[PDB]
Spike glycoprotein (Severe acute respiratory syndrome coronavirus 2), 752 residues
Amino acid sequence: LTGTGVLTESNKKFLPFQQFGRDIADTTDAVRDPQTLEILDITPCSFGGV
Amino acid sequence: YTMSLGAENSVAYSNNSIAIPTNFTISVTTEILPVSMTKTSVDCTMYICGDSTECSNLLLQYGSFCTQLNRALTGIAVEQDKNTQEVFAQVKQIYKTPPIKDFGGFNFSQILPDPSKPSKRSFIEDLLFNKVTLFNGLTVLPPLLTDEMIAQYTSALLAGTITSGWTFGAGAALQIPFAMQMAYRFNGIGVTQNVLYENQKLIANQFNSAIGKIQDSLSSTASALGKLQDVVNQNAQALNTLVKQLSSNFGAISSVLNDILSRLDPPEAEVQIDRLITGRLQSLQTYVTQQLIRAAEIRASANLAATKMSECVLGQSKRVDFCGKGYHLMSFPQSAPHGVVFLHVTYVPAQEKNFTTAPAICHDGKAHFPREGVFVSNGTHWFVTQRNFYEPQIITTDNTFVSGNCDVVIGIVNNTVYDP
Amino acid sequence: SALGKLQDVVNQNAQALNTLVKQLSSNFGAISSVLNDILSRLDPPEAEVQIDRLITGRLQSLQTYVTQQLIRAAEIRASANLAATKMSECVLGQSKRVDFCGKGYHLMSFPQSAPHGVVFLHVTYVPAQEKNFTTAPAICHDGKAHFPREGVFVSNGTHWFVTQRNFYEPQIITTDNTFVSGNCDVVIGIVNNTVYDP
Amino acid sequence: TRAGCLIGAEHVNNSYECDIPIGAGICASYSIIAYTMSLGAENSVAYSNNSIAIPTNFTISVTTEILPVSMTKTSVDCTMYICG
Ligand SMILES: *[C@@H]1O[C@H](CO)[C@@H](O)[C@H](O)[C@H]1NC(C)=O
Ligand SMILES: *[C@@H]1O[C@H](CO)[C@@H](O)[C@H](O)[C@H]1NC(C)=O
Ligand SMILES: *[C@@H]1O[C@H](CO)[C@@H](O)[C@H](O)[C@H]1NC(C)=O
Ligand SMILES: *[C@@H]1O[C@H](CO)[C@@H](O)[C@H](O)[C@H]1NC(C)=O
Ligand SMILES: *[C@@H]1O[C@H](CO)[C@@H](O)[C@H](O)[C@H]1NC(C)=O
Ligand SMILES: *[C@@H]1O[C@H](CO)[C@@H](O)[C@H](O)[C@H]1NC(C)=O
Ligand SMILES: *[C@@H]1O[C@H](CO)[C@@H](O)[C@H](O)[C@H]1NC(C)=O
Ligand SMILES: *[C@@H]1O[C@H](CO)[C@@H](O)[C@H](O)[C@H]1NC(C)=O
Ligand SMILES: *[C@@H]1O[C@H](CO)[C@@H](O)[C@H](O)[C@H]1NC(C)=O
Ligand SMILES: *[C@@H]1O[C@H](CO)[C@@H](O)[C@H](O)[C@H]1NC(C)=O
Ligand SMILES: *[C@@H]1O[C@H](CO)[C@@H](O)[C@H](O)[C@H]1NC(C)=O
Ligand SMILES: *[C@@H]1O[C@H](CO)[C@@H](O)[C@H](O)[C@H]1NC(C)=O
């Protein structure tokens, strides 16, 4: 699964089998790294009109 | 079942019968009007594809659609700011209530602000704000006027209404005791001011109880703020439909562009990208057109709210059913998340009574007609009373005028007119 | 910039029509944005494909313009209905509605034409040079209460007069400009003074 | 600001009847200064229970209200436009 964003620590508690999380409107918001099994949030880096 | 249109009552019509109320109720009724909606902006190029150069290049060739969509949305946002301005920026000066509150027994403590720092908003306003409960190129711009400043406009309008009457809406704010302002408003609806001055404690109790009752209804009974909630729900649902529509093929291999780029050659890549872009433009244009029509609806509502604030908070309206059932006495504005709540204080006649009338009185061969009332009789004696309240008075020359002989008017009754 | 509304609507229409005409130079994916080159440069089948793409693009363009124009026409029709209402209730008569025919107590109004609109000159009465006075709900004379027929009871400190509400025109309190209602023990704020009988 | 960040404007404590709107009540004017907008002049009416204010003079004020009535009657021939 590919994307662009900034990764942050998370307090979310995935179930053991669950890989990545989605919010309403079916957007990826968290993921486990396959290496050390930690939940990390994905948020789009800043955009906005000038 | 088949619906019932209401209770069937037939009034006791007669050619010499009238019913004149002997009492009244001061009814405070609420109306809720949306004023503005959420200010939203979707940048088209980031929405369609975003962080894909090939897509940006071959969206450049579809024209200036993105620019049109952007300008329409910006016009909508500016329009919401102007809607709030028109509804609330009605007074150029921020009035404040005096520290000592001697309003003739009337209690505005339930609609005036409190120093308990609840964002400087009244307790009814606090209930209203608690009742309404509420990334991909998509942003929400904050309103120009914050909730606190809409609260300050509302507080200024209340202070002016309760300390100056209708005067501050037509020129210099001119102080007047509130009991006298209410007497003026009673004369407006055709009831002589002695009715207020003699029933002042009763009227104040009725008004205070009505404000407390609307408080209780708002705190306990739900489904009162459904208009504002409906506006919010429609906007949020349209916006989620737009974002959800971004996960659709529109006839292509994949909804995401990265997989199309990775897994197709540039000819077929541009064909599939063409179909994703055409689908996503149709979705965006559908969204913007729907939002423009909803903007028109909210603009009509905000213009109506501005009219109501001008004609019912800053004055007293003779337009029946414009500011509540009953004869309008006054109105109070209260802010809401995206709208205004009017508490209309009206005069509803009550405790009606059977009487017998007459078009005129024949005395000394002359026909006498009332100046500002109506001839009534309890069965034996004739009186002149005002139309909206039973206050019988002896028929005299000061309250009756002569307009000819007695053999032209149908139904003239047969009586004496006292000369003082 | 006192006629920004009319200039705004004319700018909006001109801008929409300019962006309509400018879309005619967008190829929408076709080989060229001009039909003659596609015709005189491609064989009839591929020509038909390119022509179809241009047709779809230009129908989207024209339909967007027409939808926008319909919404703008709804806006202008609301403005025209409000203008008709104002010319009825402000020009053909005096209006009791507040802020409808201008700031202040409305006296009259005069229409003026403009290139695509109307300019209402609202003549209103704005009170000024206010003075404080001491009031009373009623006057108790001969044990009976006296309320103004039309006006308000004021005092300059020592004498009581009756004036109209919107202009300081004092008058001696008489039985001509006052009516009696009950005794003088029910009204709160009643004051003692003589009521002249002519 | 709640509306983003301003680069090039000096924040001032003073509150003015503002000119260029920014958002969240911040709105700037002319160095370029940004500030929280003042709703208006604060005045307190001298309310009392035996006090009235009666005007002793008046002004006849003439105001202007502009109302759009019509817009340009434009016709587009669809087939001529789209095909030429
Ligand atoms: C009022 O009520 C009484 C008793 O119900 C009735 O006799 C009388 O006719 C009514 N009034 C008139 C004017 O008919
Ligand atoms: C009118 O109604 C009020 C309460 O609604 C009541 O207290 C009063 O006795 C009634 N009658 C009069 C004459 O006020
Ligand atoms: C108004 O009502 C509140 C509670 O409803 C009470 O605390 C306050 O004293 C009342 N004010 C007056 C003047 O009676
Ligand atoms: C009608 O009014 C007169 C005048 O006060 C009063 O004397 C009388 O008792 C009233 N009732 C009847 C039935 O006449
Ligand atoms: C009312 O009608 C009755 C009969 O219908 C008639 O006797 C009486 O004169 C009428 N009264 C008036 C005032 O017209
Ligand atoms: C009313 O009184 C006058 C006195 O001249 C008389 O002409 C007339 O007949 C009376 N009306 C009736 C209905 O008796
Ligand atoms: C007269 O009224 C004004 C309000 O316009 C107030 O500022 C002033 O204090 C009043 N004068 C007195 C003597 O109270
Ligand atoms: C009030 O007006 C009367 C009218 O003649 C005048 O005699 C009196 O001096 C006035 N009082 C004051 C305090 O100006
Ligand atoms: C006006 O209010 C004051 C309270 O400071 C009170 O002493 C006075 O009796 C009141 N006057 C009237 C006429 O109600
Ligand atoms: C008004 O006059 C009556 C009778 O002379 C008197 O009892 C009352 O006290 C007077 N009012 C005042 C405020 O002095
Ligand atoms: C603004 O007010 C703050 C205190 O809230 C103060 O520290 C600062 O110096 C003030 N700035 C100006 C320009 O007055
Ligand atoms: C009312 O104001 C005008 C100027 O606005 C002035 O000429 C006139 O003298 C004033 N009237 C009075 C009675 O002072």
Remarks:
- The interface with chain D takes residues 81, 89, 91-98, 102, 104, 141-146, 148-149, 152-153, 156, 159-160, 163-164, 168, 171-177, 179-180 of chain B (CB under 8 Å).
- The CA atoms of residues 266 and 295 of chain B lie 42 Å apart.
- The longest helix of chain B spans residues 266-313.
- Chain B is about 40% helix and 20% strand.
